[PDB]
Structure formats: C-alpha cells, structure tokens
C-alpha cells in the first residue's frame, strides 16, 4: 500500500540479484524491523546493506 512507496524513497533505485530474491522477500516482509513503521529507518538501512552483500552483487 504505502510501505512500498515510502521505503523506496529512502533506499533509492536499489537492485537485487536473483540469488537474493527470497532473501529480499524474507527481510522486507517477515523481519521485525521492516514490519513496524517506527523502525522504517532501520528497514531502509537493512535493504541498502543487502544490495552490497557478496550474495546480492552483480
């Protein structure tokens, strides 16, 4: 609804490799940081650090 529109502004045009397709889904939807709106500052930093991990590269 709106979580998707807000968090993209924080992280920008982030890209995720196919190896992190389920890693992204688990982090975005199931982690406590990305489910409580008060911790959206945390979720933005989580997704950004995910893209630079060795798994999500290329």
């Amino acid at each position: 609804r709106m979580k998707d529109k807000f968090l993209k502004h924080l992280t920008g045009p982030l890209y995720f490799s196919p190896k992190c397709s389920k890693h992204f889904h688990r982090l975005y939807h199931n982690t406590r940081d990305c489910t409580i709106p008060a911790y959206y500052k945390r979720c933005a930093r989580l997704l950004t650090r995910l893209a630079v991990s060795p798994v999500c590269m290329e």
């Binding site: 709106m2 529109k5 807000f6 502004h9 709106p37 008060a38 911790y39 959206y40 500052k41």
Partner: protein, 307 residues
C-alpha cells in the same frame, strides 16, 4: 544525480540552534552552502538559495523526545513529512533542523547521577509517602524539536513542510501509549503552543510564549524551553527542550514542538508523558507518503529530483 542536498543540525544539540561556523564545517566538501541567522528570531535557522526552477521532493524529519528517568524507556520518535513542491530559481528557503530533546540521564550533577543509577530513592520515597511529586521534581526528558521548512513571502513567512518533534518520555513511564500522529493542512487554523503545565508544552508556529520552561514558537526563535522551575532549587535537573519548540522537562515529560505544540501534564504526573507536536504541509504541495514516526535523535531535511 548529485542533486542530493542533505541538511543536518551541523553538530548542534540542545535548546539552541547551530552557528554559521558550525554549519560551514558540517557541509565541508559537500555541494551545499547555507546562511545561518546570527541573532534574533532567525538565530540557528539555515537559509538556502534554490538553484533552479523545477519540481523538488522535500523530505522533512522531526526530532525525537528525551529519554525517561530510571526506566529509560523507548523515546517518542519524530515525525516524517515527505512532500513534492514546485520551486522557482533564487527562492530563499528557510530551514530549521529540529534537535533532539535533552535526556534526563545521565547528568553532570553529583547528586543527580545517584538518582539515575538507582541508589538515591528520594523520588520513589516521596511518591510512596505523599502519593505525588510536589517537592523533588524532575526526572523526565525534554520535548523534541520540530523541523520547519518555510519561505518568506513579502513580509510574512509561509510554511511548506513542518515535521513535528516527539514528546519527552516521563520519569516513571513504564508504557509508551503508542499515540497516533496528527497532520494539519489548513492555514486558517493557527498553530499555537501546547497546553503547558508542570512540564513545558511544545512551541507552535506563531504564539506568545510566556513561561520559561515552555518551548518558543517558530516566529519567536523556536528555542527549547528551559527546565522545570520546581526541578530547580532542589536539584540540578537541566532537562530542556530541543531546538525547534521543544518543551522543558519535569517529573512528567515535556511537550514536543511543531505547527501546534504538544501538550504537557497539568499536575506533574511522573508516569505521564508529554504529547507529540502537530505536523503541517502546505496545500500547494503534494504529500508523497503520510506522516509516520520514524526519526530517532536529530531531524534532517532531504531534497532530491525523481519526478
């Protein structure tokens, strides 16, 4: 794109804003250069010159309130207001970056620190004996400052984005009440200060602040309110509001700043927090995402181009 202009508190913290020298160092090796008010109601307010006419995305972030006393519970976070605005070349944008409200603990006073670590229980003692706090006041955090983004018209400032600050956490606040946000967008509603009581209330957009411990309004300098008067003469509880209309701290929590200042406990209830401020977005703009409490610590301002 390198249109990423980020505004911070320039390292300043407390009831007063940053200086011109502080922001010159904070924005070193950056693409940003601003003017800072040196005295008067514009003291601590950053002035930025808009470089080009385009559609801008203005991301406003309020500041969080102060920590509690012995409990040190989760502080009330600041409010985020993200808007889309049309700006013209050479427009002078005034930016006040909200600063965090002062925490209760730790403190520099010898007697106070013994209360913070739980060794001095005079506060708990007076509560058990006389059912309320009347003599040994203090222990709550100060109200957080709000972030104001406005541009001057002919002679009157006109607000664009106001990101309300979070209220101060009370001394014995074992609960976080989970209070919802508030956002106004009708300029005919005047943004007065909050209902200041024992603890100071939040500073609004345009009011006449009388009490020292209440947060000053935006047009009055938005200086953080001083500590509780009763928390003085007995302690050194200098728990003041954050720059941006933050209310002063007492046994109860102080009110946070914003367009309409947050309310405060009227009878010095040690378990009752101060209320958060009211945010504001101009009708001429478009709200990208509704207001959400997200910000911990000082506030920020972010301007970019995506459209």
């Amino acid at each position: 794109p390198t249109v990423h202009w980020l505004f911070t508190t320039c390292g300043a913290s407390g009831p007063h804003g940053p200086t011109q020298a502080q922001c010159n160092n904070a924005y070193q090796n950056s693409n940003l250069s601003v003017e800072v008010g040196s005295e008067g109601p514009l003291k601590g307010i950053q002035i930025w010159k808009v470089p080009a006419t385009d559609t801008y995305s203005i991301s406003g972030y309020g500041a969080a309130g102060g920590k509690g006393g012995k409990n040190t519970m989760m502080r009330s976070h600041g409010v985020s207001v993200l808007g889309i605005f049309n700006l013209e070349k050479d427009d002078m944008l005034y930016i006040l970056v909200g600063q965090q409200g002062e925490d209760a603990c730790p403190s520099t006073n010898q007697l106070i620190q013994k209360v913070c670590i739980g060794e001095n229980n005079v506060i708990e003692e007076e509560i058990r004996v006389n059912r309320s706090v009347h003599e040994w006041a203090g222990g709550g955090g100060g109200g957080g400052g709000a972030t104001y983004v406005f541009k001057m018209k002919d002679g009157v400032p006109v607000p664009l984005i106001i990101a309300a600050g979070g209220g101060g956490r009370a001394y014995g606040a074992k609960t976080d009440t989970f209070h919802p946000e508030r956002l106004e967008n009708n300029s005919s509603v005047l943004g007065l200060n909050g209902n200041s009581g024992a603890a100071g209330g939040g500073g609004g957009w345009n009011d006449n602040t009388s009490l020292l411990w209440a947060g000053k309004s935006l047009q009055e300098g938005a200086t953080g309110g001083h500590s509780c008067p009763q928390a003085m003469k007995k302690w050194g509880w200098e728990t003041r509001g954050g720059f941006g209309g933050g209310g002063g701290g007492c046994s109860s929590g102080g009110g946070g700043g914003g367009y309409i200042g947050g309310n405060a406990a009227s009878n010095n209830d040690p378990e009752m927090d101060g209320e958060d401020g009211v945010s504001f977005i101009s009708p001429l703009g478009i709200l990208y995402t509704p207001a959400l409490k997200v910000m911990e610590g000082h506030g920020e301002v972010n301007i970019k181009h995506y459209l």
